[PDB]
Design a protein around this ligand. Structure first.
Ligand SMILES: [K+]
Ligand SMILES: [K+]
Ligand SMILES: [K+]
Ligand SMILES: [K+]
Ligand SMILES: [K+]
Ligand SMILES: [K+]
Ligand SMILES: [K+]
Ligand SMILES: [K+]
Ligand SMILES: [K+]
Ligand SMILES: [K+]
Ligand SMILES: [K+]
Ligand SMILES: [K+]
Ligand SMILES: [Zn+2]
Ligand SMILES: [Zn+2]
Ligand SMILES: [Zn+2]
Ligand SMILES: [Zn+2]
Lengths: 370, 370, 370, 370
């Protein structure tokens, strides 16, 4: 039983992005949705917190909100031209911030709050106030480029908190493991030429950004060797993701020797997600958390911070997030994941599992870890 | 430009199945859904018809409803013990018809209507009134066992229409191709010992029924060799599904020589579906329809009937169904699928594509077609 | 049994107006809605048509769509400055057309189609092709001022069709009876100085526009005496509305002697509506339709056109609209309104009923009809 | 600034009641709803709490949950025959508990929790731990008869807490003021023959139970004179409700001299509610709370407990509940009710206001208070 922080704020559920039919904007041949719909609905994140409450887990955590990330915090990552336009659209009722980047009224302040939850979670663990922490950051961060919103992300949540910790708290080497099912292209770009931040992405081959695999992009200049892309095959499930972690991610952590491990923790690799094609269940996320926590215990005194990213299965993500918080806190509630046994039966058979293992083996060899 | 029937009835959208959070029943650890949700929502089927209307396709089709399947029709497939319990629950306001089989008030009559749309679509094509036909049958049929509801299905839609056509219209050999992403276990079971109906299922390996692949189940007795299961790898997309059709399904059709080809046409292999993990787009469904229509032209005077099964991506299924109706009617509207290019970029790379091709090749060899 | 036209088009259900929590725009202290919500949802209008289908009424009507109102049609009512801005916002993806006037992508074309359904319904009845007609016009029209959108209305549906009929079909005197629960301020303004169009509004005192009663606004110049406002007391129900019709509206019709009677037919006086406080049920709307149809038989050869306006009780409006179409067509289906008896019991007692009767009596005397 | 308790539990939002189209059950002529809908959705209560959080009010309150009401607690009000059937249906997955009484899985435990929140709120104020308290009890209580569920209510929340306080805490005279817009028939029945509990209901004449006004039902036996029904006219607004309070309710409180004042606090008199026809706004509820709090200060040392009942305007109830909590706590947030000015303009004009005042005057005279 560890002292585990949970950083969240009701306001993060109020960020809106206009009318969508799942991911499609309304208009032309896309009929308006009759009820809910839009993928980045707050309901997925809210239902996770709701389940944490009814399970009795919440009162055993250190609950916190946070001051929003300041303008100085944002400027470590994003140029003023981007921030001023983001704020302008937000200030004027919402609208488009470039193609496929809809935001709502006050989304600017809410995005800053989301980034601040990450900032505070990182600071608390580094100072030793908490053993580990989870930040329920909405909107997400890991696709956000310095000057371009992408994939529902408007600020670079994890990079903002990292650069803050580097300027204010003397943070050294840090590893960012991104197991959101989509490529962490924002994190990758920001740290591409830097050897002080090790960026690792496990992602469905070609999912988002579309067509990007990226195993050959290892970083540039001083950063060469300090970026790792693991494009897993669409359809992969529990065995494949855990194999990738233990075979590539953990050995990379051991070679890098970080002061802190941050997870870009998306759940959209879950077996019901509409936005990707992987077959993970709640125990998959439970095991992956155990793997990185134990690495944290060996490498940086257990210092581990997880920042929420994606996840779009409204009824199933809550069980995956509870599993992560149970593993992170070391507290097991009475909740049994009602789809666990079902998804276990759906797992790829041994021919696929071994084919995927081969491919992970080649990646490990390509990255100098085998 | 063919004379294409479209069989549908507003009442089929009124069948309900109680409260669900996507697929999970409400209760215990499953929070009630705040808005829409439940997977077998009518909205997916309605949005397809709506798009057919606004695209201008609908008036160029032969629109029809149908008389419901009669009690005699149902009795060719289902025993009275099952039918009487189904009707009893339906008559008393809805409820459970065995584990995981929720139905609503009047679901019995609506299920009979759904089966009747299939009955009529088959009869019209056989009589030469239409060149081909599509039946928007809701609730679906292909998981329904004679005495057990499964997978949202309460009557065996396609088998009921087939046995009707065999008793009333002298129908001989027929092939049923099931490209709903889940295994057509209901069709398979009903015809397992029969050589007059060739049953073929393309399905995600192990998806539903969970854990079932089934390549080795070829039929029994006189039916041995007349059932074909193609368990494709989760994650497979456009290349893999079309390869399976041309490599296994078409050659099997040519050897069997049917009088009629019926498609169990589900769309849940689409790249956004929450209930499976395949990567098909609208052109995938367009090409598969072309493949089976051209087979129909060579083998049974173009006689082709498609019966709607699954499909749970509420914004994307409509574009897939429009594509099928465009291919089936030979009429192309102005509608461009707004996600086509996106999903094309997400397709598995050549290593997976070739691995899956190998596996299809082994299946073809196992089935005596190579 | 009359030849009754029903003018509708699926596209009218696709007009959207952004994100709303019932009537409130999202932002500030207004949390985004978790599911459906926004008042001018298409679902109310769609559920009426759906019920018409399942009841068996639809095939006994003359179903039609219409060519959209042309730019010349719109210019009889609206100045180019307003139309060009409306089209500009619509053409650029939707947005605000002045304060509290949100519209969506393509709303311009859909509004023109809505107005065209009214245009065609009026033309068919005038030419004697139909005995009477109903136009399911969405978006609504009766609050639209020449140069200002108001109350969900972006074009003046009924005035556009009237002026079209006056220029193309030699239409003379016409009476417009508006029993939408809100004041028909758009119709009133357009015809304020004209004696060739008699405009009558029954509306909840002060509801919308807010604070407007209007009994003393009788028209201006040549139009003085040709506008009639009946501000009924919030809470009034079946007795009060029918009394107002027979006591003020019918006698006014008899004195004016119209060539055509058009109903601005809103249902938001229904006993469940969130946007007003009246207690009407389906038989109330059935009786009001009978009253105006019989007036039409006496005054203008039965020529009666009804144009859909408001109505925001998603489960109850469909029964009210069916009732109107049953009365209009002279066809009674098997449908019994499941809330009729309930709402009948909720009706104001005799003290209120008589107080409201007194007030109607004073209005009748004020208008020279008693 | 008072010490104000707020009793709530996430589990109360999980009680479900099956599929409804607003208030209508699905089936027959009632089409299933496409999105949200059903009137007793948790969203109304949740959005109030959400707004309390984002406004900054919540941390200034004493937040509490409660132990559920025990079986002994329930038995002070309800017979075992009713409780055992309620629990049986709840234990078996939900279903009907008599006509028009749908409940869901585990609704029994959740109803007990709802009643326990009321029990605890009453106990805390009586013991002097809090100055006043609000209980966010869902499901509601005030229509529940001892042996019959009615109007969304399955246990008699306020009577259960009262009888508990009378047996365990020596509670004497108590007054229950019910300003939910519907008649508190459950409270009335339970205390009909008792002079130790004064029951007062302000309600829309004839709304629910339908057709019931009840001014002449004053209580029976020893209870005669200790029940007060104020059937206000549908359509009444701010002036009328406040006049009734000051003219009938406050003088009745002063004559009775209670030890405690409990409000059955429903918000469905709000000007947007689908289930009644009154025109109250947030300041109306703010003023009514002030009136009863000041009475509490004069009569029973400020001891005031409010228990949540109805309220079905999903976007507007939250502003009314915030207003009540602001008045109750003596803390004003920055939130301005965005519809206040609008609803103020909709208020009945002076003719109605004076007519309603007359009727209240007669009631006051009938009850011996003028
Ligand atoms: K995405
Ligand atoms: K790097
Ligand atoms: K990733
Ligand atoms: K299924
Ligand atoms: K067979
Ligand atoms: K299949
Ligand atoms: K309005
Ligand atoms: K006029
Ligand atoms: K009106
Ligand atoms: K009620
Ligand atoms: K009493
Ligand atoms: K009341
Ligand atoms: Zn993602
Ligand atoms: Zn399927
Ligand atoms: Zn209206
Ligand atoms: Zn109520």
């Amino acid at each position: 039983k560890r002292k585990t922080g949970f950083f969240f704020d009701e306001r993060c559920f109020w960020h809106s992005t206009g009318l969508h039919a799942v991911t499609l904007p309304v208009g032309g041949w896309v009929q308006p949705p009759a009820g809910g719909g839009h993928a980045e609905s707050p309901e997925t994140k809210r239902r996770m917190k709701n389940l944490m409450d009814v399970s009795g887990l919440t009162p055993q955590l250190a609950l916190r909100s946070a001051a929003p990330a300041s303008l100085e915090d944002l400027r470590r990552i994003h140029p003023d031209s981007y921030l001023e336009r983001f704020k302008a659209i937000s200030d004027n009722g919402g609208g488009m911030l470039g193609k496929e980047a809809p935001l709502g009224p006050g989304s600017y302040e809410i995005a800053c709050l989301s980034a601040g939850l990450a900032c505070a979670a990182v600071e608390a663990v580094l100072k030793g106030e908490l053993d580990n922490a989870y930040s329920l950051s909405r909107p997400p961060g890991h696709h956000c480029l310095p000057d371009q919103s992408m994939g529902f992300c408007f600020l670079a949540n994890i990079p903002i908190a990292v650069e803050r910790a580097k300027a204010q708290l003397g943070l050294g080497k840090v590893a960012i493991i991104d197991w959101d099912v989509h490529h962490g292209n924002g994190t990758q770009h920001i740290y591409l030429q830097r050897d002080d931040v090790l960026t690792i992405s496990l992602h469905q081959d070609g999912c988002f950004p579309p067509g990007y695999a990226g195993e050959d992009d290892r970083g540039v200049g001083a950063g060469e060797g300090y970026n790792i892309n693991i494009p897993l095959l669409a359809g992969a499930g529990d065995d494949s993701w855990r194999y990738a972690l233990e075979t590539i991610v953990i050995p990379a952590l051991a070679r890098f020797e970080p002061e802190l491990i941050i997870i870009a923790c998306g759940y959209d690799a879950n077996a019901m997600d509409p936005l990707a094609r992987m077959q993970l269940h709640s125990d998959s996320f439970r095991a992956m958390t155990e793997q990185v926590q134990q690495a944290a215990d060996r490498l940086c005194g257990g210092k581990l911070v997880m920042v929420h990213e994606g996840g779009y299965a409204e009824s199933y993500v809550p069980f995956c997030g509870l599993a992560v918080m149970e593993a992170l806190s070391g507290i097991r509630t009475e909740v049994q994941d009602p789809l666990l046994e079902f998804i276990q039966q759906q797992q790829p058979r041994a021919t696929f599992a071994q084919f995927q293992r081969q491919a992970i083996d080649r990646l490990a060899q390509q990255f100098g870890l085998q």
